[PDB]
Structure 1
Amino acid sequence: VELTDGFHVLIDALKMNDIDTMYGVVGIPITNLARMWQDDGQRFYSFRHEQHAGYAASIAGYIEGKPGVCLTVSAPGFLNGVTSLAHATTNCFPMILLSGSSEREIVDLQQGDYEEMDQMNVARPHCKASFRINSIKDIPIGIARAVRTAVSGRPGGVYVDLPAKLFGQTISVEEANKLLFKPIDPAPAQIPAEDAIARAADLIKNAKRPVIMLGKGAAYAQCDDEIRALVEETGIPFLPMGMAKGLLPDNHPQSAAATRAFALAQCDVCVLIGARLNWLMQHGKGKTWGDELKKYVQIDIQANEMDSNQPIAAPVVGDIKSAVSLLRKALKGAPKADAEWTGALKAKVDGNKAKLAGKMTAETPSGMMNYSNSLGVVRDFMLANPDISLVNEGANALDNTRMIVDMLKPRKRLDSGTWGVMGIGMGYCVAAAAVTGKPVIAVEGDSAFGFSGMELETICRYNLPVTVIIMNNGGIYKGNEADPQPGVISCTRLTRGRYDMMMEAFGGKGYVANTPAELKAALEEAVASGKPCLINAMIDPDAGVE
């Protein structure tokens, strides 16, 4: 007798799968879905462009271990969001893009429907799976397939097409209750066999110059104690990848990060934990590895990732928590790494660390700070306040921040990722604030910032505790490239604008820092105020390198 509709069944299916937040932009034909979602008591963050709603979704998935959800309209909105879905998939971040689509009959004949596109098809190369839910009765199963696909195996993006006709369909309330359900164990553990473990243990026990590489896959796994115990019990030196920073504290005694180049070229046994031997690792080839094939151990949940670049002497397939637990049990009681090895690296590290300290104390003209002395301030602040998310992107602004700013806690550093994407900054800030409930600090190149800058309005609209630091050097890499022809500005130039004024235009707080002292003062006040702020840090136009 009593009926319910597509809108409500979808809302119930999402809540059923523990989804309480969605990021997106409204309009035909999903505006009423967002309203009812809010009316129902769940939260919806509206952005100014779908790409950045999608970037927020992708990083929410990385932080929480459950698919971040992005909602968009058809055709052009879908396309904007699919670019972020592709980013999630290459980064192995669980994410679900939900998009409304037009009429099946008109689209299938290419007659020119409103926002016409076979979105399901277009999405295929950018996600793990692309589905379409045509019937109200299939909503629970549909959402279940999406969640399982996004979080199981190698996590990634999933596209779910929602035809406009779906929302208006009806079904008896009694019937709808038989259909709704909660999937059991959507992200199962996958334990490797003992002989696989035994093989890796032996390579490790017999290594002379061993090293452990931690990738963001390890950080994602959320088994920080297992990995920390492994590193300290074996006494092996470790190197963290960009987003693996903080898994163990960056200033940990066993960190060989400060002497990476040397540690890699000299090691004989390299243990890869949730890290791909891709471009970020020079593919295991080149002088960075002393022009020789190392004996690799690799732990990854994706079986065919093994031998993708170089032969892997000890492949260990399964989830990181299960595998590390077994590897520790196999190495229990074995002698720690050789002191001459671990000692020769620490020495190197101390040298570089002392040298870096040398640049951070250097003086500069007002409004002409360089990367070392400006970032040194952020470094000191983060060490004192590690429970804050650090968003970071750019070129000089990225590489230097990764070198200078120490992370003491895991899953706090959120950067450009595998594709070296410019544009994740602001979306990453909304998601980090929304899912952590703690402050966020974003170190942005001024070029990188431009890709998502309008979202400052979103940060202000939701009054998030985000402090955006713009490394304003006036351009890409450098801010002083000469005019190619008299009267024409170089393509790498950017207006050394008042981004602080832009922030205030939407209700935020803005600062302008010309020296390390002003930067520190502004940063401390900004973060403590709990208000959305922007610090326009003036960097020497020539301080950067290409």
Structure 2
Amino acid sequence: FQSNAMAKSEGKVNGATLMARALQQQGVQYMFGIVGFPVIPIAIAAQREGITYIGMRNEQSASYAAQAASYLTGRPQACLVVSGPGVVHALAGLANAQVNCWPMLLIGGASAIEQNGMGAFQEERQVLLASPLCKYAHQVERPERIPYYVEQAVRSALFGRPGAAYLDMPDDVILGEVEEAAVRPAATVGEPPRSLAPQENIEAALDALQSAKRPLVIVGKGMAWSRAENEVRQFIERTRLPFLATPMGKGVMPDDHPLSVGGARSHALQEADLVFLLGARFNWILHFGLPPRYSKDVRVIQLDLSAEEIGNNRQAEVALVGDGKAIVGQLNQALSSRQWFYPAETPWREAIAAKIAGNQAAVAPMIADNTSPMNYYRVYRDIAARLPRNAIIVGEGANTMDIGRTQMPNFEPRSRLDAGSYGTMGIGLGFAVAAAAVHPGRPVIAVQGDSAFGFSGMEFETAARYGMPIKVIILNNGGIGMGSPAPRDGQPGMPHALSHDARYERIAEAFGGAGFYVTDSAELGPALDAAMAFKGPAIVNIKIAATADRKPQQFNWHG
């Protein structure tokens, strides 16, 4: 049938189409998840409006992909999960997005309202389970209110401190029909509001910088979310202050900028008398701004959108509450009427240069060491020389990610996605799929350890199914953080042990991708060149030394 010559009603619309039109109206371009009861019509309706749907292999990776796409696009992107266990699997993405202050829209199906209390198929208190992990969580009780709830959730997830929003969609709401003309419209959510700091706070910030003898600027991913790279790069060029990038703050300032103190991080944090926080929290990543990693009398200028975050752990001398791009614009404006810049010759620049040269001399022999099995720094020598300038880099593991953080530079903002503020394993291939869906014209390279790849390695089939040429590089030392000798007979396997002889790259051959196995330093170069030139996804399985480690440091990263 379906003949156009035949009369049709064509005056009604159902909840799935309203959800699709509302999502597209609010800038949702990507939807990751796994279909089934009752959200099959939602994914189909999303495709009719132009929303790109991506079927994953686990809702855990799907929820991670939604927030990564949100951080990259700047607007909340969707995750579609089924009722019951589909939502519980997605709680991983809600908690992770909450800790990173990233937006996210989780759309979870539910059993029909008329069956509540009966023990229906996958009936669950889904709003209650998700509420403590979301900025916004509500159930859409009737289809004609879908435009209201979608605009509500997107605005709550995008405005202020970004967080996750959850919308519960019962099956009878998805399938319920309403008159096309009887549905109330909803306004389109615009750019998140930016606010400014008082003028006396701006001048007090510039005064404190001039009074500092060993100043240090710390650039966090809050500035990347603000798209403040232009303002920050103008601020560092105008002030000539040394800066330190956070893990995912890399790229906002080019990693090869001569004012970076990355190769002297411990000394810079320890000896600085004044610290300028740019969208960065004094949490575990920055060692709480307290001893034994900071001077007891460290002075703090804190720029954060959340007023409650000011003075946490270490008191802030100058508070700058508001948007990063807007406030740094003020600082650049107020600097134009001043002749102060950090002088070109100070003992502080002298000490930073020495510590950078000292740390480079410590890792230099390991970078050149060609003996097999290879160490971490030897592996990254061949990786780094082949990472394009506009690449998007996903990092996951312990030594693989942390050493890769210092060996893989980023010259553009929002081009690094790692374990983040939650220290999460399982974001690897989910972040890569999101990066490959948002920037299909840019290279996507995921560098994971053997343990990290096992959390989401099945998502490699997702990439090959949607033609995503993701370059997965596995650093297999045979365990979690460290290799282990093979157990004697009767001796159980070590709890951290994995499979050092595993051929993870054959998973790529299972889904039409390219697989490469490396055990010798002479194989590494040609194996990476082949995986880069391969028109499709690839896996390079590098068997590294079991005892390999990072260069020694005065303090432990966790302490």
Secondary structure of 2:386 counterpart: helix
- Structure 2 residue matching 1:80: 3-state secondary structure: helix
Q: Tell me: CA distance 1:526–1:141, structure 2 relative to 1, closer, same or farther (3 Å).
A: same
Report whether the alignment pairs 1:511 with 2:521.
Answer: no
2:379 alignment partner in structure 1: 374
Q: Is the 8 A contact 2:244 2:265 kept in 1?
A: yes
Shift of 1:506: 1.3
Deviates further, 145-154 or 35-44: 35-44
- The equivalent of 1:68 in structure 2 is 77
Superposed CA deviations along residues 198-241 of structure 1, whole A, max 9, x for unmatched, are 22122112111100001111111112110011011111100000
Letter in 1 for 2:44: R
Specify every segment of 5 or more residues in structure 2 that has no aligned partner in the other structure, as ranges.
Answer: 1-8, 551-555
Q: Which SS does the other structure have where 2:75 is aligned?
A: coil
Q: Aligned partner of 2:119: which letter?
A: G
| Residues in 1 aligned to 2:489 and 2:102: alpha-carbon distance in whole angstroms | 45
Structure 1 residue matching 2:421: 3-state secondary structure = coil
TM-score normalized by the length of structure 2: 0.93
Q: Aligned AA for 2:427?
A: I
Equivalent position of 2:228 in the other structure: 223
Alignment map for 1:372-411 (pairs within 5 Å): 372-382=377-387, 385-411=388-414
Q: What's the counterpart of residue 424 of structure 2?
A: 421
**How many Å separate the matches in 1 of 2:195 and 2:165?**
21
Alignment-derived partner of residue 128 in structure 1: 135
How far off its partner does 1:507 sit?
1.2
**CA–CA separation in structure 2 for the residues paired with 1:404 and 1:356:** 10
Partner of 1:45: 54
Structure 1 CA distance, aligned partners of 2:115 and 2:45?
28
1:272 corresponds in structure 2 to 277
Q: Which residue of 1 aligns with 2:13?
A: 4
CA RMSD of aligned residues (A): 1.7
Query: Counterpart of 1:99?
Result: 108
The TM-score, its normalising length taken from structure 1, stands at 0.95
Structure 1 distance, partners of 2:175, 2:191, is 29
Match runs of 1:479-494 below 5 Å: 479-481=483-485, 483=487, 486-494=490-498
Pair 1:310-2:319 in alignment: no
Residue 267 of structure 2 corresponds to 262
2:105 counterpart of 1:87: no
Task: Choose which of 234, 253, 265 in structure 1 pairs with 2:239.
Answer: 234
Q: Is the 8 A contact 1:511 1:522 kept in 2?
A: yes
Aligned 1:178-197 pairs, distance under 5 A? 179-197=184-202
Superposed CA deviations along residues 431-454 of structure 1, whole A, max 9, x for unmatched, are 000001122111101001111111
Distance in 1, matches of 2:77 and 2:23, equals 11
SS in 1 for 2:505: helix
What residue ranges of structure 1 are gaps of 5+ in the alignment? none
The residue that corresponds to 2:460 in the other structure is 456
Q: 2:526 aligns with which of 521, 529, 533?
A: 521
What's the CA shift for 1:330? 2.1
Residues in 1 aligned to 2:527 and 2:368: alpha-carbon distance in whole angstroms:
19
Q: CA deviation at 1:150?
A: 0.8
Cα distance in 2 between the residues matched to 1:146 and 1:466: 32
Shift in Å at residue 105 of structure 1? 4.8
> For structure 1, which segment, 400-409 or 44-53, has the greater mean C-alpha deviation from structure 2 after superposition?
400-409
Q: CA deviation at 1:354?
A: 4.1
Q: How many residues align?
A: 537
Distance in 2 between residues matched to 1:442 and 1:54, nearest whole Å: 18
Tell me the CA shift for residue 479 of structure 1.
1.6
User: CA-to-partner distance for each residue in 1:501-538, whole Å, 9 max, x for gaps?
Assistant: 11101111100122344222222222232310000011
Q: 1:288 aligns with which of 284, 290, 293?
A: 293
The one-letter code of the counterpart of 2:125 is: D
Q: CA 1:483–1:529 in structure 2 vs 1: closer, same or farther (change >3 Å)?
A: closer
Post-superposition CA distance 1:17-68 (Å, at most 9, x none): 1112200001000112212322444321001110101101111111111012
Q: Partners of 2:321 and 2:485 in 1: how far apart?
A: 49
Deviations 1:297-338 (A, max 9, x none): 011111111122111111100010110000122233332224
Q: 1:484 to 1:116 in 2, by over 3 A?
A: farther
Q: Does 1:151 align with 2:158?
A: yes
Amino acid at match of 2:71: Y
SS of structure 2 residue aligned to 1:32: helix
